[PDB]
């Protein structure tokens, strides 16, 4: 993998990652996002419906929470998860947790972190974690890590320290296990920057992780309620400073368009696309402008009666399947009558709109019109 920067406007890194995914090359753009999935399918969408979307990201995020239960099955399939889930054309990043639900936390111990599934708590030792990675064969995978800091609010400085030390211990063990296996060689490991709200431990985490031969870094624990971020936003830029620039920066739990822009300012490259999913799930549609649990400002609520007779598309000019082929009035009916097509059509548009947003970020960055974009984004509905 090689990251090349087209430009660096303000603190914002515009570029491409060229030799990605083992098989030849797959050019992936920064800054960018990752197709959010549940059990390896995009939520609500089959291949048909997925490929009906313009600007689907090259890489797709999947999570151990859903896949680990079926370690056995995947071990028997012997051909890796991409082919199993019928996404063979896609690059795959395996995260430890689903960002929409990071509530359970692993009950991390020195010898075990645990994801949460339908079955229940799945206790993964390092060996088991690396075993699962063998079965899955993703392009990228987050290394087993201790991210519980954010979950609790106590943040005992001794706890914060353990989060860093544990994460580094896991990283070093996993690196060795990768050395031994040929298959695993082909996978790229992602280091997890940690340290919570303690500046010192954040910098310590950043440097020590960077010392390892990881392919990229995950910025954990900045995931927070909307108000909290501005605070941790300073800590963010402190940390990215300590990371080498020739390696990509992932962040977890940040998908809100506003927060996204800001993290790009602080030199973050890759984002989860779970925000469009959450919007979909509450019967809402992304309407905010980019072209140049509370319902947010970026969206309208199609459950509302104002839309029962509104025969405009969701967003005028949106080339997605739904806006082009259907009206708000129609979606309103679908939601009201509790039909599964509501979700499919909402997911399709919400994804396409979000994917369009990123396209205009990169475009803005080329013309240093990003500040104007910030303002256009904060336009209401």
């Amino acid at each position: 993998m090689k990251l090349s920067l087209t430009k660096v406007v303000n603190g914002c890194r515009l570029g491409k990652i060229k030799n990605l995914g083992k098989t030849g090359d797959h050019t992936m753009d920064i800054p960018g996002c990752l197709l959010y999935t549940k059990t390896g399918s995009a939520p609500h969408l089959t291949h048909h419906t997925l490929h009906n979307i313009h600007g689907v990201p090259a890489m797709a995020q999947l999570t151990l929470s859903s896949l680990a239960e079926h370690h056995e099955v995947l071990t028997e399939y012997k051909e890796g998860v991409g082919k199993f889930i019928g996404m063979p054309e896609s690059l795959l990043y395996c995260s430890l947790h689903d960002p929409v639900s990071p509530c359970p936390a692993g009950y991390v111990t020195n010898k075990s972190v645990s994801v949460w599934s339908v079955a229940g708590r799945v206790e993964m030792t390092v060996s088991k974690f690396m075993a699962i990675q063998k079965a899955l064969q993703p392009d990228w995978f987050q290394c087993l890590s201790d991210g519980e800091v954010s979950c609790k609010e106590a943040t005992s400085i001794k706890r914060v320290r353990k989060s860093v030390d544990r994460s580094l211990l896991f990283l070093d063990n996993c690196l060795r296990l990768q050395e031994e296996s040929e298959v695993l060689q082909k996978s790229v490991i992602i280091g997890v920057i940690e340290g919570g709200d303690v500046m010192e431990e954040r910098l310590r985490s950043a440097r020590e992780t960077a010392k390892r031969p990881v392919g990229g870094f995950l910025l954990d624990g900045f995931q927070g309620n909307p108000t909290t971020l501005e605070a941790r936003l300073r800590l963010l830029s402190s940390v990215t400073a300590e990371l080498p620039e020739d390696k990509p920066r992932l962040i977890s739990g940040v998908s809100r368009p506003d927060e996204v822009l800001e993290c790009i300012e602080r030199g973050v490259d890759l984002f989860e696309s779970f925000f469009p999913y959450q919007v979909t799930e509450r019967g809402c549609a992304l309407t905010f402008s980019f072209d140049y649990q509370e319902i947010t400002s970026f969206e309208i609520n199609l459950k509302e009666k104002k839309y029962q007779e509104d025969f405009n598309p969701l967003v005028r000019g949106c080339s997605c399947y739904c806006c082009k082929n259907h009206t708000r009035a129609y979606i309103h009916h679908l939601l009201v009558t509790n039909e599964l097509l509501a979700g499919v059509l909402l997911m399709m548009h919400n994804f396409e709109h979000y994917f369009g947003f990123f396209h205009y970020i990169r475009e803005a960055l080329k013309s240093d019109k990003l500040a104007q974009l910030k303002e256009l984004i904060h336009r209401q509905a």
């Binding site: 549940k38 399918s41 609500h44 089959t46 099955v73 889930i85 025969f311 009035a329 039909e339 499919v344």
Partner: protein
């Protein structure tokens, strides 16, 4: 004016192949018609249906009449525009709801009064209202509101409903304001009584409605009776007009009823069975929620052309069905509609090629292991129109 053009006829049986010439394009028959009730195919986009090569699907007046309301759909360029369906739409009157919503149903000669437990607000469905709604929706084929009684019930009830239907039919024929664009169809509500059904057959055929449907047969009626009442109905229905059997979508049922002269069918079964995690195969069905299909890396049906069977394994679906992802349901809905269409298209071909009897034997060997293990009812039904199975 005849809306169906006949093409071929298995000499041995009553099996017919033909075409329906409707305002929104030709429809090959025999035809299975997927049922999307509230202007939706329950999880699939109109494009996905368009791709499966479906040329006619249903909507339901009762549901659509209440929500979203006839006025709204009219402002929406009709049911066609609303759901963005290019092809033909057929609309049930709201008759069936009598059986399913028997609890909420009060019957007078004036119409059917429907209440919903959630909302006090009530609805009368007079033939006139049913027609009014259907005229607004603009469905190519509309259906008469009939007094539908369940097959299980016996009493003067059967007789009363049968005659009421006739009067309701005339009121519907009266109510129609759009014959040019929409084709009203009568429904033979005779119950399981030969005489009543027969009497209903006689009087109803006397009206000049474009097609005829066979109703009252969707229940758990004995199978021996089921097929006989079909046979009775078809034997007396105009050959130069469609025979639409309503509430039937099981494979063995569909094969046999084509052989008994039926031309059109609708059923919610394929779409529902899909939302319940069952996938239809030549050999019956696959309960994919079951743990057996965990390491099964083959498709649902190697011979299926539907998108699900091209790109997905039984194993992955089995894992996805246990997920919170609704995608699992859609993959099955897609395939199940495909199976039914592949079956109906397969059947029509065999009628045209004068090997419908051969087709049926091949079918029965798939479904039942042998024509040997075929259920007696189907054996009786087939033999009555001159098809034995070795």
């Amino acid at each position: 004016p005849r809306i169906m053009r006949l093409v071929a006829e298995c000499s041995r049986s009553r099996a017919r192949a033909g075409e329906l010439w409707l305002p929104h394009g030709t429809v090959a028959t025999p035809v299975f018609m997927p049922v999307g009730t509230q202007a939706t195919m329950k999880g699939i986009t109109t494009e996905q249906l368009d791709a499966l090569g479906c040329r006619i699907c249903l909507g339901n007046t009762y549901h659509l009449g209440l929500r979203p309301g006839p006025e709204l759909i009219q402002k929406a360029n009709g049911l066609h525009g609303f759901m963005n369906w290019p092809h033909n739409l057929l609309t049930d009157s709201g008759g069936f709801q009598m059986v399913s919503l028997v609890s909420l149903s009060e019957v007078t000669e004036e119409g059917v009064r429907f209440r919903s437990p959630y909302d006090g607000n009530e609805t009368l469905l007079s033939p006139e209202k049913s027609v009014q709604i259907q005229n607004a929706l603009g469905s190519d084929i509309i259906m008469q509101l009939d007094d539908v009684v369940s097959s299980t019930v016996t009493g003067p009830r059967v007789e009363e409903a049968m005659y009421r239907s006739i009067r309701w039919l005339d009121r519907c024929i009266a109510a129609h304001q759009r014959p040019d664009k929409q084709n009203l169809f009568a429904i033979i509500q005779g119950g399981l009584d030969a005489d009543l059904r027969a009497t209903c057959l006689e009087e109803m055929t006397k009206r000049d409605v474009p097609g005829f449907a066979i109703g009252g047969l969707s229940g758990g009626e004995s199978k021996s009776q089921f097929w006989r009442m079909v046979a009775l109905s078809t034997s007396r229905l105009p050959k130069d007009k469609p025979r639409y059997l309503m509430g039937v979508g099981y494979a063995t049922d569909l094969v046999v009823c084509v052989a008994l002269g039926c031309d059109m069918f609708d059923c919610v079964f394929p779409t529902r069975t899909a939302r319940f995690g069952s996938a239809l195969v030549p050999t019956g069905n696959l309960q994919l929620r079951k743990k057996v299909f965990e390491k099964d890396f083959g498709p649902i049906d190697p011979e299926c052309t539907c998108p699900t069977c091209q790109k997905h394994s039984r194993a992955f679906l089995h894992a996805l069905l246990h997920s919170d992802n609704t995608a699992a349901l859609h993959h099955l809905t897609v395939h199940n509609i495909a199976y039914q269409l592949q079956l109906m298209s397969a059947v029509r071909t065999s009628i045209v090629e004068k090997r419908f009897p051969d087709f049926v034997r091949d079918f029965m060997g798939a479904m039942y292991g042998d024509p040997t293990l075929c259920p007696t009812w189907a054996t009786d039904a087939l033999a009555s129109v001159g098809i034995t199975l070795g």
